[PDB]
Structure formats: structure tokens, C-alpha cells
Amino acid sequence: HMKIDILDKGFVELVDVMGNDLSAVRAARVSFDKDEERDRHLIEYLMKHGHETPFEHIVFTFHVKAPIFVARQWFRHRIASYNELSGRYSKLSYEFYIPSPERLEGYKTTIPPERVTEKISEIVDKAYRTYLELIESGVPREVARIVLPLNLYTRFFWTVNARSLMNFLNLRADSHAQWEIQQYALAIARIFKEKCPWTFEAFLKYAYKGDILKEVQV
Amino acid sequence: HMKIDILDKGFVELVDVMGNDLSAVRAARVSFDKDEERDRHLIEYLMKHGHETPFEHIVFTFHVKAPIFVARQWFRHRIASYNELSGRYSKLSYEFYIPSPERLEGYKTTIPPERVTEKISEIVDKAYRTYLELIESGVPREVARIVLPLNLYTRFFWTVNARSLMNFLNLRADSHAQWEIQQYALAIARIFKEKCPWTFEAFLKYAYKGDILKEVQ
Amino acid sequence: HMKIDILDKGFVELVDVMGNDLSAVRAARVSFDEERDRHLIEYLMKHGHETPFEHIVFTFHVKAPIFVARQWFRHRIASYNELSGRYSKLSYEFYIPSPERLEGYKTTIPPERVTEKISEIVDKAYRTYLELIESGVPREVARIVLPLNLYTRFFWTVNARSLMNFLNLRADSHAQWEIQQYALAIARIFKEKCPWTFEAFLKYAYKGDILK
Ligand SMILES: Cc1cc2c(cc1C)N(C[C@H](O)[C@H](O)[C@H](O)COP(=O)(O)OP(=O)(O)OC[C@H]1O[C@@H](n3cnc4c(N)ncnc43)[C@H](O)[C@@H]1O)c1[nH]c(=O)[nH]c(=O)c1N2
Numbered sequence: 001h002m003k004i005d006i007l008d009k010g011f012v013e014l015v016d017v018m019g020n021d022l023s024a025v026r027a028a029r030v031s032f033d034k035d036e037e038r039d040r041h042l043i044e045y046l047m048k049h050g051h052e053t054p055f056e057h058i059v060f061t062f063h064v065k066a067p068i069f070v071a072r073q074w075f076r077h078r079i080a081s082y083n084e085l086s087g088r089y090s091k092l093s094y095e096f097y098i099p100s101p102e103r104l105e106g107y108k109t110t111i112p113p114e115r116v117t118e119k120i121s122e123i124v125d126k127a128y129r130t131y132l133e134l135i136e137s138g139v140p141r142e143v144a145r146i147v148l149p150l151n152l153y154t155r156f157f158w159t160v161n162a163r164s165l166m167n168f169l170n171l172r173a174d175s176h177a178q179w180e181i182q183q184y185a186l187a188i189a190r191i192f193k194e195k196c197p198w199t200f201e202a203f204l205k206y207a208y209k210g211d212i213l214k215e216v217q218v
Numbered sequence: 219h220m221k222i223d224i225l226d227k228g229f230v231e232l233v234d235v236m237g238n239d240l241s242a243v244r245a246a247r248v249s250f251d252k253d254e255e256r257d258r259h260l261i262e263y264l265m266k267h268g269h270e271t272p273f274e275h276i277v278f279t280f281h282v283k284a285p286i287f288v289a290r291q292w293f294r295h296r297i298a299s300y301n302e303l304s305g306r307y308s309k310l311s312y313e314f315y316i317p318s319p320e321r322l323e324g325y326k327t328t329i330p331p332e333r334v335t336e337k338i339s340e341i342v343d344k345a346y347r348t349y350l351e352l353i354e355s356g357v358p359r360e361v362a363r364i365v366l367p368l369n370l371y372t373r374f375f376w377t378v379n380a381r382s383l384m385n386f387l388n389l390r391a392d393s394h395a396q397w398e399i400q401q402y403a404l405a406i407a408r409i410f411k412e413k414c415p416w417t418f419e420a421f422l423k424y425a426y427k428g429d430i431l432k433e434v435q
Numbered sequence: 436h437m438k439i440d441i442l443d444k445g446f447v448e449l450v451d452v453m454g455n456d457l458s459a460v461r462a463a464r465v466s467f468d469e470e471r472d473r474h475l476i477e478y479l480m481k482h483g484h485e486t487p488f489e490h491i492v493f494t495f496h497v498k499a500p501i502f503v504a505r506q507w508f509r510h511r512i513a514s515y516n517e518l519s520g521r522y523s524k525l526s527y528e529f530y531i532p533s534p535e536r537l538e539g540y541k542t543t544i545p546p547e548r549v550t551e552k553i554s555e556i557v558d559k560a561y562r563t564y565l566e567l568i569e570s571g572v573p574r575e576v577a578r579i580v581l582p583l584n585l586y587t588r589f590f591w592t593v594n595a596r597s598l599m600n601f602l603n604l605r606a607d608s609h610a611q612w613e614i615q616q617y618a619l620a621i622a623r624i625f626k627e628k629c630p631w632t633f634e635a636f637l638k639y640a641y642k643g644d645i646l647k
């Protein structure tokens with residue numbers, strides 16, 4: 001069971017996986033039926049020459065809890081399946097991402113980093129209180145929720161294949177992506193490396209365009 | 219590793235599956251967490267109201283051997299993964315689909331159905347022999363193969379989710395589709411029913427647009 | 436309508452196009468807008484921000500043998516509609532390679548004899564098809580004996596990003612020669628309608644060899 005905590009209340013949990021490195025080998029050769037040195041050489045060959053389609057036969061299902069600003073960027077990856085918690089089939093919860101003062105250390109600010117954390121905490125408390133007041137007064141949830149901030153946490157199931165997951169890592173596991181989604185991508189890369197060590201090693205060696213996966217050990 | 223033989227030399231083999239009916243239940247509720255009657259009611263609810271996205275979290279991998287005319291129609295389903303045998307990583311084989319005379323029974327023909335079967339075998343034998351002669355003479359395979367007929371068998375891996383598989387069944391498991399692909403679709407439906415009984419039953423009950431799955435068991 | 440003849444009887448014809456290089460500029464800025472716009476196209480291409488190129492769409496009418504079409508139809512991020520004979524007239528023509536196609540390979544029989552042997556077997560298969568049709572065998576059954584060089588026609592609606600992926604794979608010497616010819620025609624039409632995008636693609640993103 002793999003569950004990695006992210007940010008202050010998030011997580012990336014592995015729900016299920018179909019296949020391993022050999023699923024890509026089996027799909028490339030088109031045979032059910034092996035040989036570590038030969039099959040690992042095939043994985044590297046496929047990656048080096050751009051034959052990425054065999055990697056689509058390795059599938060993962062994740063359960064991610066993330067703030068709406070992180071989820072909005074994540075959901076931009078169209079070649080995947082998503083099902084977000086809406087409150088139609090299960091209980092809806094209300095938590096927010098408050099950045100720690102360490103997040104701001106590095107930027108020259110006129111007010112202490114701690115004070116920024118305080119100001120953020122304060123406005124989300126006010127918006128949440130306003131939401132509850134509107135709910136208590138009979139305003140439908142769909143209307144009342146529009147005042148809630150972008151740091152509101154949401155939960156979703158993500159079903160994605162290894163090829164689309166590698167595209168996600170190229171873009172999100174990189175210093176140009178927002179720090180919050182970099183953290184989420186590191187957790188995805190960690191679970192991916194655990195289930196597909198050969199594919200992950202070949203990806204870093206031949207196809208990976210980002211920077212943080214070659215520096216940070218997953 | 220269920221295998222179903224289709225036609226004279228083809229097959230549909232289940233390579234792998236991720237999840238079951240509960241994977242759609244887990245995705246709809248968004249929880250990795252005991253009432254079969256309540257879970258089956260949710261599957262039926264999702265299917266009646268058109269909330270099909272939870273069914274995308276059930277994935278199948280099939281190994282299919284089919285003639286190129288069947289594969290060309292199959293490969294039109296874009297929301298899926300495919301990897302066909304080309305001869306770059308494994309041995310290439312040469313076999314052909316010869317329809318049995320029973321395939322023609324139902325159509326009033328001027329020549330016996332056995333004569334149609336014979337005419338088809340004759341053509342593949344001559345075309346295949348011509349291919350081998352050109353190969354033996356030093357003509358590259360990519361050129362010599364262009365004379366091979368559409369009934370040449372091919373093999374491929376198909377990775378598809380339950381929602382896209384249900385779209386495939388709506389179109390191919392239907393009397394308006396070619397008989398050959400209907401057989402292949404019946405094998406896919408059989409494997410699907412075995413792994414996802416609740417989803418398959420709900421699909422026939424509310425979402426299935428075809429006709430042969432409601433007649434053939 | 437641009438039109439390029441490929442092989443003995445095939446073609447690549449431009450049916451329609453939505454947008455130009457500025458459609459990618461407009462989508463990237465989320466605006467309605469010369470040296471700055473071309474610099475943006477090159478920037479987008481060199482940094483991998485490919486999504487603005489999805490807002491340039493093309494529609495092609497392609498006549499190609501089934502062996503070429505089978506590889507083409509593998510590109511899933513596109514729209515296709517092939518002639519089946521349900522709404523319009525079905526035609527039967529075949530790709531016969533010219534002797535020049537075999538020049539370069541040491542063959543035991545002359546290249547003209549290979550061309551002849553190919554015409555012969557496709558004539559026999561086509562005649563067998565017509566005999567089965569005349570005898571009352573449904574087209575869907577009789578056609579299974581037709582060879583892979585039988586020409587088909589289809590409409591292809593694809594955006595510039597997916598078209599660039601197609602060029603990376605098909606406009607390359609490792610692809611079959613017949614496929615290279617069709618990809619050259621697609622690249623030619625693309626260059627004509629999107630000169631800046633095509634030049635930037637060639638400069639930074641293009642992985643193949645024959646377009647350079
Ligand atoms: C430098 C830079 C700058 C920006 C941005 C990216 C980058 C790298 N983006 C983000 C961008 O628009 C997009 O959301 C992500 O790059 C999504 O990654 P994919 O397209 O790979 O994922 P996705 O899952 O959508 O696609 C995966 C792969 O499938 C293919 N694909 C899928 N759907 C396709 C389609 N419809 N047509 C063609 N190919 C398709 C492509 O090969 C693609 O890489 C952006 N966004 C934004 O809204 N505003 C902005 O200003 C920017 N800025």
C-alpha cells in the first residue's frame with residue numbers, strides 16, 4: 001500500500017496498477033508466453049528510438065488529495081481518466097492549503113514570511129465562515145461555494161498509462177512548474193519507479209526533459 | 219488467461235485486467251475503502267444516468283489474432299492502445315482467413331458456397347506464392363507484401379478501458395457490423411462479462427444500443 | 436484546393452484549413468493579434484509549449500493504397516472518414532510500383548519483371564473479386580481477397596500539433612518509401628499555410644531527416 005503525504009493535507013496514494021516493465025516488452029513483441037538482460041535492453045531501445053506506444057499497456061490508478069489550484073493544472077492532462085469528489089456519492093470535506101513560512105523564504109518580502117502565512121490563514125477562515133453562514137441561511141451549496149478560495153482541497157481518482165504519466169513527469173517534475181505540483185509529481189515518480197524500475201531508469205536516460213528527477217532521489 | 223478461438227485461425231486472449239466492478243464504485247465515491255446490494259445499485263445508477271467516467275478505471279489488455287480487414291475496423295476505435303506485430307521485435311507469420319461455406323448460407327448465390335471458399339483459398343495461395351517468389355528474388359519485404367490479400371492474419375495487443383470497450387460493443391456487437399467482427403466482439407463481451415458481471419449486466423440493461431448481445435448468451 | 440499527386444494514382448488534396456501562424460500566437464496570448472509574432476512561434480517551439488499549435492486545423496482528402504492508410508490511421512489524435520460505398524461510389528484501382536522503385540536492390544529478375552508480376556497477381560485477385568460479386572457473394576466477403584495495394588480514399592481532419600507528430604515519424608528515411616512520399620505532400624501543404632510554424636518545427640522540434 002503506497003501513500004505519500006504532500007503539502008499540509010495532501011497525499012498521493014496508489015489504488016491499483018496493471019502490469020510492470022514486462023507488460024511493455026510483451027506489448028512490443030505481441031506475445032503472452034522472460035530474459036532480464038534482453039528485455040531490459042528492449043525497454044531502453046523502445047525509449048531511445050521513440051517507440052512509446054508499448055508503455056501505454058502499463059496502467060496506474062492514483063487517489064490524490066490536492067488544492068484546486070494544483071488540480072486545475074493536473075486536469076489539463078487530457079490523456080487520462082479523472083473522477084473528482086463532488087458530494088453526489090460520498091461525503092464532501094472542507095480543508096485548505098496554508099503555505100508554511102518556508103515557502104516564502106527566498107523572495108524579498110516587506111512583511112515577515114510568518115505574517116504572509118497568517119494573512120492567508122485569516123482570509124480563508126473568513127471565506128469559509130461566509131460559506132457556512134450562506135449554507136445555514138438556505139443558499140444552495142453550488143452558489144455558496146463560489147466564495148471559497150483556490151487553496152481549497154479536492155480529491156480525485158487518476159487512471160493514467162505509463163506513456164501519459166511520463167509526459168506528466170516531463171512537465172510537472174521540473175523547476176519551471178509551480179513548487180506545489182513539483183511535490184505531487186515527485187510522489188508520482190516515486191510510485192512509478194517502484195512499479196516500473198526499468199521503464200523509469202530508461203525514461204531518465206533517454207526521454208526525460210525536466211531537471212528535478214535527475215537531482216532528487218525518488 | 220482466457221482464450222476464445224474466432225474464425226478458422228484467429229483468437230481473443232485476455233492478457234491482463236486492472237480492477238473489477240468495485241473499481242468503478244471506488245472511482246465514483248473517490249475512496250479506497252461491504253454491501254454487495256448497495257454497490258451493485260450504484261453500478262446500475264451510474265449506467266442509467268450516463269455517469270460513464272467511473273468505468274474508465276477498469277482496464278483490459280487483450281492479445282488478438284485477426285485478419286487485416288477485421289483489424290482495420292477495430293483500429294478505428296481511437297480511445298485505446300494498440301501494438302501490432304510488425305517483425306521488428308518478434309517473428310512474422312503468414313496465415314489467411316478462409317471463410318467456411320456456412321458463412322455464405324443465407325445469400326442466394328449462383329455458385330455453391332464451397333466454390334466461393336475454394337476461389338478464396340486459390341487467391342490467397344497464388345498471392346502468397348507470388349510474395350515468396352518476389353522475396354526469393356531479392357525484392358524487399360515492404361514491397362513484395364503489397365500483393366497479399368486483406369484476409370492475411372495479424373496480431374496485436376489492445377489495452378482499453380471498460381467505457382471505450384462498451385462503445386466498441388455498441389458498434390461491433392450488432393447485426394449491422396460485419397459478421398467477422400461480430401464474432402470478435404462476442405468474445406470481448408464474454409471476457410468482459412466474466413470480469414465485470416455487474417457492469418456488463420447494467421450495460422445490457424441501460425446503455426447497450428446493439429442487438430446480438432441481448433439474443434446470444 | 437492544393438493537390439499533390441503521389442505514386443501512380445494517389446493524391447493529397449487540401450479540402451480546408453482553419454487559421455494560420457497567427458492562430459497559434461492568438462491562442463498563446465489569449466488575444467486577437469510581425470517580428471514579435473514570429474519570435475513567439477520560435478519561442479513556443481523551442482520550449483515545448485505545443486498546445487497553441489492545436490488551434491490550427493487542416494482537412495485533407497487522401498487517396499492511398501491500404502498498406503499506407505493502415506499506418507496513417509494509427510495516428511489516433513485526428514478525425515477520419517474513409518469511403519465505404521454507403522453514401523458515394525466505390526472505385527477499384529491498385530498501386531503498381533514502377534521498376535525504378537526496385538533499382539538499388541540486387542534482384543535475380545529485372546525490375547520490370549517484378550512490376551509485371553505485381554500487376555499480374557492484383558489483376559487475378561481483382562478478377563476473382565468481380566467473379567464472386569457477379570455470383571451473388573456480398574461485397575464485404577468478396578473484398579477480402581483484394582491485395583494491400585488497393586487504393587482507398589479518406590478525409591483527414593488534424594491539428595498542427597498532431598500533424599507535426601505525424602511528420603516526425605513518417606517524413607523520415609526509416610519509414611517505407613511510399614509513406615515518405617505522402618508525408619512530403621502533407622509537409623508541403625503545411626509549409627504553404629503555416630510558414631513560420633513549419634520553419635520553427637524544422638529548426639527545433641523535427642526529429643526526422645528527409646524534410647531537412
Ligand atoms: C512553456 C509552457 C508554457 C505554457 C504551458 C506549457 C508550457 C510547457 N501551458 C500548459 C499547456 O497548455 C498544457 O496544459 C500542458 O502542456 C499539458 O501537457 P500535454 O499537452 O502533454 O498533456 P495532454 O494529456 O493534454 O496530452 C498528452 C499528449 O497527447 C497529445 N495530445 C493530447 N491531446 C491532443 C490534442 N487535442 N491535439 C494534439 N495533441 C494532443 C500530445 O502529444 C500531448 O503531449 C499553458 N497553458 C495555458 O492554458 N496557458 C499558458 O499560458 C500556458 N503556458
Ligand SMILES: Cc1cc2c(cc1C)N(C[C@H](O)[C@H](O)[C@H](O)COP(=O)(O)OP(=O)(O)OC[C@H]1O[C@@H](n3cnc4c(N)ncnc43)[C@H](O)[C@@H]1O)c1[nH]c(=O)[nH]c(=O)c1N2
Pocket residue numbers: 080081082083084085086087088089267268269270271274297379381382385
Ligand atoms: C450523472 C453524472 C454525474 C457526474 C458526472 C457526469 C454525469 C453524467 N461527472 C462529469 C463527468 O465525470 C465528466 O467529466 C464530463 O461529463 C465529461 O464528459 P466526457 O468524458 O463524456 O467528455 P470528454 O470531452 O472528456 O470526452 C468525450 C467523449 O470521448 C470519450 N472519452 C474521452 N476520453 C475517454 C477515456 N479516457 N476513456 C473512454 N472514453 C473516453 C467518451 O465517449 C466521451 O463521451 C462527474 N465528474 C466527477 O469528477 N465527479 C462527479 O461526481 C461527477 N458526477
Ligand SMILES: Cc1cc2c(cc1C)N(C[C@H](O)[C@H](O)[C@H](O)COP(=O)(O)OP(=O)(O)OC[C@H]1O[C@@H](n3cnc4c(N)ncnc43)[C@H](O)[C@@H]1O)c1[nH]c(=O)[nH]c(=O)c1N2
Pocket residue numbers: 294295296297298382385389513514515516517518519520521
Ligand atoms: C451508421 C454508421 C456508418 C458508418 C460508420 C459508423 C456508423 C455507426 N463508420 C464507422 C465510424 O466512422 C467509426 O470509425 C467507428 O464507429 C468508431 O467509433 P468512435 O469514433 O465512437 O470510436 P473511438 O474509440 O474512436 O472514440 C470513442 C468515443 O470518443 C469520442 N471521440 C474520439 N475521438 C474523437 C474526436 N476526434 N472528436 C470527437 N469525438 C471523439 C466519441 O465520443 C466516441 O464515441 C464509418 N466509417 C468510415 O470511415 N466510413 C463510413 O462510411 C462509415 N460508415
Ligand SMILES: Cc1cc2c(cc1C)N(C[C@H](O)[C@H](O)[C@H](O)COP(=O)(O)OP(=O)(O)OC[C@H]1O[C@@H](n3cnc4c(N)ncnc43)[C@H](O)[C@@H]1O)c1[nH]c(=O)[nH]c(=O)c1N2
Pocket residue numbers: 028049050051052053056079161163164297298299300301302303304305306307509510511512513597600604
Ligand atoms: C521505432 C518505432 C517502431 C515502431 C513504431 C514506432 C516507432 C517510432 N510503431 C508505431 C507506433 O506504435 C505508433 O502507431 C505511432 O508512433 C503513432 O504515434 P503516436 O502515438 O504519437 O500518434 P497518435 O496520433 O496516436 O497520438 C499522438 C500523440 O498523442 C499521445 N497519445 C495518443 N493516444 C494516447 C494514448 N492512448 N496513451 C498515451 N498517449 C497517447 C502521444 O503523446 C502521441 O504522440 C509500431 N507500431 C506497432 O503497432 N508495432 C510496432 O512494432 C511498431 N514499431
